[PDB]
Amino acid sequence: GGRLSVDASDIAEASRDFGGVARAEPMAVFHPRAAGDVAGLVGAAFRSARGFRVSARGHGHSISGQAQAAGGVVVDMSRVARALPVHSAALGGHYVDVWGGELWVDVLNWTLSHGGLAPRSWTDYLYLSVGGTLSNAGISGQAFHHGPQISNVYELDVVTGKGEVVTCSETENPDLFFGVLGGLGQFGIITRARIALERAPKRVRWIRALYSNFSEFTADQERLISLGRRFDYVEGFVVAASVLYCLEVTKNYDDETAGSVDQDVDTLLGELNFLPGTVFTTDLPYVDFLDRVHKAELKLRAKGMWEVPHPWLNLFVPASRIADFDRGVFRGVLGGPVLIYPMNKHKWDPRSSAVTPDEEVFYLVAFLRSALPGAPESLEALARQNQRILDFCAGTGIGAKQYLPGHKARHEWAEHFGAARWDRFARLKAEFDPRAILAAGQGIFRP
Ligand SMILES: *Cc1cc2c(cc1C)nc1c(=O)[nH]c(=O)nc-1n2C[C@H](O)[C@H](O)[C@H](O)COP(=O)(O)OP(=O)(O)OC[C@H]1O[C@@H](n2cnc3c(N)ncnc32)[C@H](O)[C@@H]1O
Ligand SMILES: O=C(Nc1cccc(OC(F)(F)F)c1)Nc1cnns1
């Protein structure tokens, strides 16, 4: 039922990503109609003499060619009938089956219009595929409480590196299920994901408060994630003044809780140590808050500042070493935001392929800088800054782990996973993709 394409615009899009650096071209782009089409293509790759590379492309948000299939075939997973949300008395909640290539923005609109339901755990940007984020983790301000998106999925349909369609969960083929979650596309292509849902809030009380003291800022973020009155979202960012820290929190509400929202916010804020008179508040619908990054994208696109190189660096930093990151990186080493917020490791299932630091509390530190348009030297200076951040972590023994890892050397991947996790990862590759057909742009395995 699928269609192979050699259209120059199809090839060009499959040969690029948001990073704007890696440009490995496929021989063709495959447009599937259903899961069986994806199975057919991977099956032919597995059966072929040379064993050509096959990679699924979500929305192309990768930084360094992770979705590229050099001289092979890129599967354009972008979008037919959609499954309606379902209630389960056994799970004690709702779920929705979605196509692997579905964008989170389209999942949200579908679930809201069919029962006022929504996923519990997000990414900051909704124009990302379900298969794409589930192959990494999928993190935002809710992860401290609900865990990442890989902790909010009941079941998958996976097309393995042998072109076999497998239904998997915790109780059915758990090795493939847990391997695929945070598995960097190594063990198969997600064609279906069964997403956990909750009754969606109607509105959001979105708060920002400033700190000049890093010790007070991190102490407040750490207390907020341990919280039963609590915020529904906890993030933060580094701002140039010398250096300031912005705490970002939200309180979700609906018609029932509308009458208590003001007091709940005031109570929680009173316990914090932000700078007096630096509180900024917005009240807006739930969809609008979740789509806030798409609004920033439209403004950047109009200024020609979206289709520029993005040498993004994402680190998971153990909370015991975050203090050293202030004078060492934010005041030391250093257009674009620097995100910072802690998460709880216990909300992350240790059976998944996801790699986190060996500490109960760890931070995402996200360097989201854009290079100047049409200026290669800008990208080069930013790449040197990223290497200086990595050298700082190595030289001071910070047990940081990259999120969306950009490694390409075997010993670097071995160090990233550690011996036990590397052994599990390699064994899953021998079982599920022995010819190393899938997601070869990640640069982990060779045929
Ligand atoms: C560009 C961007 C990315 C981003 C973000 C904001 C922007 C503007 N905000 C994020 C956030 O708040 N939290 C988070 O966890 N991630 C955030 N990101 C990063 C994003 O998650 C990643 O870029 C991720 O790769 C998803 O993006 P996308 O859906 O575009 O997928 P991809 O880049 O094409 O492919 C990524 C890898 O996964 C493999 N792949 C793709 N689809 C599948 C399926 N269906 N099954 C299995 N593997 C799949 C690709 O081959 C590639 O290896
Ligand atoms: O990217 C974000 N958040 C995020 C937040 C604001 C804006 C933004 O995109 C930009 F800068 F282009 F407007 C991304 N979080 C990530 C986590 N992991 N990789 S990226």
Q: For position 189, which CATH number holds?
A: 3.30.465.10
- In single-letter form, the type of residue at position 13 comes to E
- Residue 280 CB burial class (10 angstroms; 0-12, 13-18, ≥19): exposed
Same domain, 220 and 246: yes
Beta bridge partners of 317: 363
Residue 28 phi/psi, 5-degree rounding, is -155, 165
Looking at ligand 1, which residue's alpha carbon is closest to its atom 11? 123
Decide whether any atom of ligand 2 lies within 6 Å of the 366 Cβ: yes
> How far, in Å, CA of 70 to CA of 55, rounded?
9
Q: How many Å lie between the centroid of ligand 1 and the Cα of residue 126?
A: 11
Domain edge (last residue) among 156, 180, 201 = 201
For the CA atoms of 208, 211, 216, 219, the dihedral, rounded to the nearest 10 degrees, stands at: 30
Q: State the DSSP code for 17.
A: -
Closest CA to 83 of 96, 94, 71: 96
- The arrangement of strands across the sheet holding 338-344 comes to 280-285, 203-211, 243-253, 233-240, 338-344, 361-367, 313-318, 401-403
**Phi-psi map region of 443: left, alpha, beta (phi>0 left; psi -120 to 50 alpha):** left
**d(CA 136, ligand 2 centre) in Å:** 15
How far is the C-alpha of 355 from the C-alpha of 357, rounded, in Å? 7
- From 131, 166, 201, the end of a domain falls on 201
Q: Which is catalytic among the residues 10, 17, 235, 291?
A: 235
* 210 and 195 belong to one structural domain: no
Q: For atom 48 of ligand 1, which residue has the closest CA?
A: 185
Could you tell me the resolution of this structure in angstroms? 2.0
Q: Tell me, yes or no, whether 216 and 180 share the same domain.
A: no
Total structural domains within the chain: 3
Q: Which ligand is nearest to the CA of 138?
A: 1
For strands 93-99 and 189-199, give the pairing: antiparallel
The DSSP symbol for 83 reads: P
Listed in sequence order, the residues at least 6 apart from 430 whose beta carbon sits closer than 8 Å to its beta carbon are none
124 a catalytic residue: yes
State the ligand closest to the CA atom of 140. Answer: 1
Query: What CA dihedral angle connects 10, 15, 16 and 20, to 10 degrees?
Result: -150
Which of 68, 90, 84 lies closest to 154, judged by CA? 90
- Tell me which residue has its CA closest to atom 38 in ligand 1: 132
Beta strands in 187-327 (DSSP E): 189-199, 203-211, 233-240, 243-253, 280-285, 313-318
387 contacts: CB under 8 Å, gap ≥ 6: none
d(CA 279, CA 55): 46
Cβ atoms within 10 A of the Cβ of 402, count? Answer: 16
For residues 170 and 315, membership in a common domain is answered with: no
Taking the C-alpha atoms of 244, 123, 143 and 159 in order, what is their torsion angle to the nearest 10 degrees?
-150
Inter-residue contact 342 to 361 (CB < 8 Å): yes
Centre of ligand 2 from the C-alpha of residue 339, in Å:
8
* Gap between the Cα atoms of 417 and 9, Å rounded: 37
The pair of structure tokens assigned to 349 is 């299932």
Experimentally, the structure was elucidated by X-ray
Residue 350 burial (CB count, 10 A): 10
2 CA to centre of ligand 2 in angstroms: 33
Looking up residue 52, the CATH number of its domain turns out to be: 3.30.43.10
CB 121 within 8 A of CB 151: yes
Sign of CA dihedral 295, 284, 250, 207: positive
Q: What are 299's two structure tokens?
A: 């403004």
Q: How many other C-beta atoms lie within 10 A of the C-beta of residue 308?
A: 18
CA of 62 to the centre of ligand 1 (A): 6
191 lies in the same domain as 213 = no
Residues 354 and 236 in one domain: yes
> Could you tell me if residue 420 is inside a domain?
no
Length of the chain: 447
Return the DSSP state at 103. B
Binding site per annotation, positions for FAD: 56, 58-62, 66, 124, 129, 139, 190, 403, 442
In a domain? residue 414: no
Catalytic-residue membership of 97: no
Q: Which string of DSSP letters, residue by residue, matches 64-80? A: SSTT--TTSEEEE----
Q: Is 125 in the pocket of ligand 2 (CB under 6 A)?
A: yes
Q: Within a domain: residue 362?
A: yes
382 and 241 in a common domain: yes
Distance CA 39, CA 35 (A): 6
The CATH number given to whatever domain includes residue 212 is 3.40.462.10
Query: CA–CA separation, 50 vs 72, rounded Å?
Result: 10
Q: Whose CA is nearest to atom 15 of ligand 2?
A: 124
Tell me if residue 304 falls in helix, strand or coil: coil
Q: Which of 233, 293, 303 to mutate to test the pocket of ligand 2 (most atoms within 8 A of CB)?
A: 293
Question: Cβ(314) to ligand 2 under 6 A?
Answer: yes
Both 195 and 211 in a single domain?
Answer: no
| Distance separating alpha carbons of residues 325 and 237, to the nearest angstrom | 13
Cβ-proximal residues to 209 (8 Å cutoff; 6+ apart), any chain: 246, 247, 249, 269, 272, 274, 275, 278, 279, 280
Type of residue numbered 12: A
Cα three-residue angle 58-63-66, rounded to 5 degrees: 55
**Under a CB-based contact definition with an 8 Å cutoff, are residues 237 and 339 in contact?**
yes
Residue 289 falls inside a structural domain: yes
- Of 73, 104, 123, 402, best ligand 1 pocket probe by most atoms within 8 Å of the beta carbon: 123
| Within-domain flag for 413 | no
> Could you tell me if 88 and 28 lie in one domain?
no
> How, if at all, do strands 117-118 and 153-159 pair?
unpaired
Task: With CA atoms as reference, report the closest residue to 337 among 292, 288, 279.
Answer: 292
Q: Please, what's the b/e burial string for 60-79 (b: 16 or more CB within 10 A of its CB; e: otherwise)?
A: bbbbbbbbbbbebbbbbbee
Q: Residue 416 contacts by C-beta under 8 Å, 6 or more apart in sequence? A: 355, 401, 402, 405, 407
Tokens at 203, concatenated? 């509105």
Q: Which of 326, 322, 239, 304 is nearest to 275 (CA)?
A: 239
Q: How far apart are CA 19 and CA 250, in angstroms?
A: 30
* Ligand 1 site-directed mutation target among 29, 74, 135, 312, most atoms within 8 Å of CB: 135
Using the 3D structure, point to which of 140, 173, 201 is the last residue of a domain: 201
| Burial class of residue 176, CB neighbours in 10 A (0-12, 13-18, 19+) | buried
The pairing of beta strand 73-76 with beta strand 54-57: parallel
Identify whether residues 335 and 247 lie together within a single domain. yes
**Distance between CA atoms of residues 226 and 38, nearest Å:** 43
Pairing assessment for the beta strands 313-318 and 361-367 based on DSSP bridges: antiparallel
In a domain? residue 193: yes
Q: How far, in Å, is the centroid of ligand 1 from the Cα of 114?
A: 26
Q: 285 and 269, same structural domain? A: yes
> Catalytic pick from 10, 17, 61, 106?
61
Q: At what angle do helices 419-432 and 410-417 cross, to 10 degrees?
A: 110
Q: Does residue 416 lie within any of the structural domains?
A: no
> Where is the chain discontinuous (C–N over 2.5 Å), named by the preceding residue?
79, 227, 241, 334
Does the active-site annotation cover 61? Answer: yes
Phi, psi of 377 (to 5 degrees): -65, -30
Run of H or E including 49: none
Domain ranges, residue 141: 77-201
Strand partners, 252: 204
Location of structure tokens 């996200």: 366
Q: What is the DSSP letter of 327?
A: I
Q: Are residues 302 and 389 in the same domain?
A: yes
In a domain, 424, yes or no: no
Alpha carbons within 13 A on the beta-carbon side of 198? 10
Catalytic residue (one of 13, 124, 155, 222): 124
Residue 401's DSSP bridge partners are 316
CA distance linking residue 62 with residue 111, whole number of Å: 26
Ligand lying nearest the CA atom of residue 314: 2
Ligand 2: centre distance to CA 124 (Å)? 6
Give the span between the Cα atoms of 272 and 213, in whole angstroms.
13
Q: Does the CB atom of residue 339 touch ligand 2 within 6 A?
A: yes
Does the beta carbon of 390 lie inside 6 Å of ligand 2?
Answer: no
